[PDB]
Amino acid sequence: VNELERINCIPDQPPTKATCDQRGCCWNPQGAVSVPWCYYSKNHSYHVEGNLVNTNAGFTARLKNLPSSPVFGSNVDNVLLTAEYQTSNRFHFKLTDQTNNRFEVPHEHVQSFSGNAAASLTYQVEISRQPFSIKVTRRSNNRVLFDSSIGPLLFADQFLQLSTRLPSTNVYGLGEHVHQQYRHDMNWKTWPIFNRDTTPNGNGTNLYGAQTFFLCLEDASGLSFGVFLMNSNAMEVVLQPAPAITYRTIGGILDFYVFLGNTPEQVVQEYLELIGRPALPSYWALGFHLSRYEYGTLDNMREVVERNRAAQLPYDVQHADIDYMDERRDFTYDSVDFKGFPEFVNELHNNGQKLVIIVDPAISNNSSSSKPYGPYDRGSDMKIWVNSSDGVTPLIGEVWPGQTVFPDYTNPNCAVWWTKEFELFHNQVEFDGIWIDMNEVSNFVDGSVSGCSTNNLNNPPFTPRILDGYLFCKTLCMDAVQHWGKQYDIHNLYGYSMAVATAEAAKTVFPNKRSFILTRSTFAGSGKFAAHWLGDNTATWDDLRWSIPGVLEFNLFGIPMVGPDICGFALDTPEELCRRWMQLGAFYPFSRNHNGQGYKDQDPASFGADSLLLNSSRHYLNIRYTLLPYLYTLFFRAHSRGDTVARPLLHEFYEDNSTWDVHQQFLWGPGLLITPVLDEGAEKVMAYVPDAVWYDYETGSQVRWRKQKVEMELPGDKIGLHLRGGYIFPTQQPNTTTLASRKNPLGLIIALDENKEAKGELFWDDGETKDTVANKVYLLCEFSVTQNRLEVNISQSTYKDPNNLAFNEIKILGTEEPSNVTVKHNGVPSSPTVTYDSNLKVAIITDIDLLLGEAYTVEWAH
Numbered sequence: 001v002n003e004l005e006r007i008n009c010i011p012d013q014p015p016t017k018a019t020c021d022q023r024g025c026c027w028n029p030q031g032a033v034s035v036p037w038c039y040y041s042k043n044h045s046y047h048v049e050g051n052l053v054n055t056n057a058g059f060t061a062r063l064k065n066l067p068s069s070p071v072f073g074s075n076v077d078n079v080l081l082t083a084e085y086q087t088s089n090r091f092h093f094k095l096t097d098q099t100n101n102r103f104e105v106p107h108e109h110v111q112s113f114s115g116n117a118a119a120s121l122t123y124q125v126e127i128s129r130q131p132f133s134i135k136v137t138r139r140s141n142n143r144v145l146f147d148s149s150i151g152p153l154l155f156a157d158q159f160l161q162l163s164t165r166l167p168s169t170n171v172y173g174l175g176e177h178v179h180q181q182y183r184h185d186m187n188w189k190t191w192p193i194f195n196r197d198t199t200p201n202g203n204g205t206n207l208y209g210a211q212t213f214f215l216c217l218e219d220a221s222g223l224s225f226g227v228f229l230m231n232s233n234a235m236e237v238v239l240q241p242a243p244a245i246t247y248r249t250i251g252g253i254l255d256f257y258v259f260l261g262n263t264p265e266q267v268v269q270e271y272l273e274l275i276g277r278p279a280l281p282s283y284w285a286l287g288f289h290l291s292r293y294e295y296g297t298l299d300n301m302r303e304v305v306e307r308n309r310a311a312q313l314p315y316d317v318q319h320a321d322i323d324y325m326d327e328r329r330d331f332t333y334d335s336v337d338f339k340g341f342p343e344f345v346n347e348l349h350n351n352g353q354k355l356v357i358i359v360d361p362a363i364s365n366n367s368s369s370s371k372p373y374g375p376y377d378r379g380s381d382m383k384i385w386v387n388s389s390d391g392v393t394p395l396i397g398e399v400w401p402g403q404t405v406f407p408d409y410t411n412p413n414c415a416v417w418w419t420k421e422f423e424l425f426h427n428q429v430e431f432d433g434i435w436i437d438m439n440e441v442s443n444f445v446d447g448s449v450s451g452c453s454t455n456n457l458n459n460p461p462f463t464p465r466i467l468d469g470y471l472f473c474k475t476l477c478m479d480a481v482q483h484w485g486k487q488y489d490i491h492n493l494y495g496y497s498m499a500v501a502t503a504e505a506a507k508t509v510f511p512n513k514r515s516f517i518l519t520r521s522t523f524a525g526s527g528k529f530a531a532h533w534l535g536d537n538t539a540t541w542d543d544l545r546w547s548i549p550g551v552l553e554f555n556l557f558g559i560p561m562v563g564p565d566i567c568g569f570a571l572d573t574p575e576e577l578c579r580r581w582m583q584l585g586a587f588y589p590f591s592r593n594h595n596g597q598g599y600k601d602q603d604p605a606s607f608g609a610d611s612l613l614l615n616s617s618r619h620y621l622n623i624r625y626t627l628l629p630y631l632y633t634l635f636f637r638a639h640s641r642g643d644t645v646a647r648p649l650l651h652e653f654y655e656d657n658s659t660w661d662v663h664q665q666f667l668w669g670p671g672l673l674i675t676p677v678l679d680e681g682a683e684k685v686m687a688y689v690p691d692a693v694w695y696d697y698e699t700g701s702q703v704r705w706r707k708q709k710v711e712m713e714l715p716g717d718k719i720g721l722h723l724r725g726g727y728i729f730p731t732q733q734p735n736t737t738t739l740a741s742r743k744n745p746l747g748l749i750i751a752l753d754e755n756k757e758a759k760g761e762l763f764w765d766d767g768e769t770k771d772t773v774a775n776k777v778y779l780l781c782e783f784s785v786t787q788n789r790l791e792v793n794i795s796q797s798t799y800k801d802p803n804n805l806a807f808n809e810i811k812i813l814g815t816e817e818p819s820n821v822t823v824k825h826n827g828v829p830s831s832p833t834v835t836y837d838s839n840l841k842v843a844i845i846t847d848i849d850l851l852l853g854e855a856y857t858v859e860w861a862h
């Protein structure tokens, strides 16, 4: 056994020969650092008993345990393998207990399979009998993708483990963590996964969400595949240089999906096809959001709002944190500190702005005849709380308002209750969206106000290396009881269930509107319902750098609307950091400056009406807003097809191995390259320029760099922004709100490729109605340039914007001087103004009016 291929048989303690011998494993203390001294023997685990049986979907096999040591308790003697050839690109297999029903994730989107095996499979499945192994190969090149034969199958009631070899070290995914880099360190590394209230820092702990998806780029051809484990129990993922990955979980079942694609993007599309594509957001959510913990008073909030508005900051959304509430209790506001809250809501609305309020799951149990608290009374009446293990008594914990009960969002009735609470509150404060927080669920006491009983749920035979090392730390007892089951099994599903229930509530509170939901805790599929922010970061240069892979990873998980707290939540933010963070932050798909309690102000206009920071912030935010039709179309593609929004360079340039570990730059979709300065004191960035024609966004000039590392000069007022030749970018003159901005003239940026051609698209709908895509009430158009000719084609034309929108400017990059510019509408002509910069090779066509929704040909000569 090559030492990189050793599968650690002692994950639970310092390795000894005595434990090694008791477990029947192999002992060799002479490897390098982290090489397991004790590893599994070559035969051990399960064997296929009898023949595989063909089914309509695929096949089943009976696996029988080869007796061995009972290390982590009650082992499963007869295992059923059920394999389903679900589509040409998606293989599904599950290992279950043959004679006992086990917990299986009650996912809202994913349905059980009742089909016939798909035809024309891009993969082949090979089963070995003695001992059991499952292998999934790519048919085209027989590349082994999944191969369990590197280690055993382990299947005890509270310890399940399967490993797979990997075809490369190009592995991206898993969460929620601060991985610091984007390409996984396949050196010996364990990542624990269990939804936990913890700090995203340099420690690499489990965080707020649970994301088992990873994608592997096989080689420079782009061939890629992905793996998803459908399991909501505590677990860890062990990575090793074989290269190999081991999933180690403490309940449920091993329910695996293997996705094949021809590109990394297609793998993400295959994954999101299964778990659920992200919601199309409200167009205003794409705007800049402003927030802080503890304005303290409405007057303080109003003062921040008005200095930023006075600064002409693009600024769509104001968030109200727990200081709006009466003593930190849901569905109230402070009648003294926040007196006039409803009038302030009207002010926001009249300014073209939106209010997002924070809401917490945990509900104060402090209610009496003399001082009723409605949310609690109404919730008790309905019996929708999480119960202690007796199954009848609501579990009592402690969060912001003191002692609290916790809604059971897995109960359908709880969503009815939750909806009515929002209905009643909306009648008082007309908020536009909801920020759901602390929904892991988080508890200021461990378990409950009286702790948790010592038992196998609260104290299991094996605990993954989760922060603190106890499941119940800062959350509910594992034996707590809910509709979908015991907390042990469904803990990782609380934030997901809460997002589902909050979207249900939006059906009533915001009829036929998308609204906006921001969630802390997530599970696979939460993007269908909500955006995410990366939690309680810190105002440091490390945190600025770590933001990028975290953003890219959530785009793989199908939560493309993701970003950090710009400028850093904890700590006073240095001006230079916040300036660079705001430059970068204008390009996070979710863009919010948020600040923790008590720290110095970090809202852009607090640095000075004339400061370099405010000026730069406004500049790059005006650029973000200009490119909102482009961003919005990318979200339309993420919603309808499953594309990423913030995208790794390698997803576009996978043929180029120099892009495989790039995590300090990213793309918006296929065509905009963002290069932030990420280092203190720096006015330069060491950057990678991919294999394409690139144009400086502001000047339009073609860079001379192609396929190489560069020192990009980026003074304190700049971030690198380049447009990819070959792409057409729809724009819209910006305003301080998207309400206003959406009524402005549009533009096209045509960045020509080496062949003087370019292509693009634009999606347009009302920007807020739910179902516009499903119901085909939208405009979709395509732009193509092939020497001397721009064509605007209309493929879907069932929405006409009432604001007479039209492209009134076309900027062509990398062009020779255009002459005789003709504009035809269905072949019918019809002279635009043409301005030309011979040094830069930029033409701008103005005095033109291409109505959104109409087909045109713009023609020119040279």
Ligand SMILES: *[C@@H]1O[C@H](CO)[C@@H](O)[C@H](O)[C@H]1NC(C)=O
Residues within 6 Å of the ligand: 383, 385, 386, 387, 391, 392, 393, 394, 408, 481, 482, 483
């Ligand atoms: C919690 O207990 C109440 C009775 O107090 C009951 O009506 C409800 O069904 C219980 N919920 C669960 C998940 O057992």
Ligand SMILES: *[C@@H]1O[C@H](CO)[C@@H](O)[C@H](O)[C@H]1NC(C)=O
Residues within 6 Å of the ligand: 351, 352, 735, 736, 740, 741, 743, 744
């Ligand atoms: C920008 O928005 C304001 C409202 O705040 C509006 O009055 C103004 O006319 C808008 N700009 C354009 C170009 O219409």
Ligand SMILES: OC[C@@H]1[C@@H](O)[C@H](O)[C@H]2[C@H](O)[C@@H](O)CN21
Residues within 6 Å of the ligand: 292, 293, 321, 322, 358, 437, 438, 520, 535, 536, 594, 595, 596
């Ligand atoms: O509402 C109080 C704070 C917010 O300011 C913060 O963004 C959020 C984090 O999840 C925790 O720090 C708790 N929440």
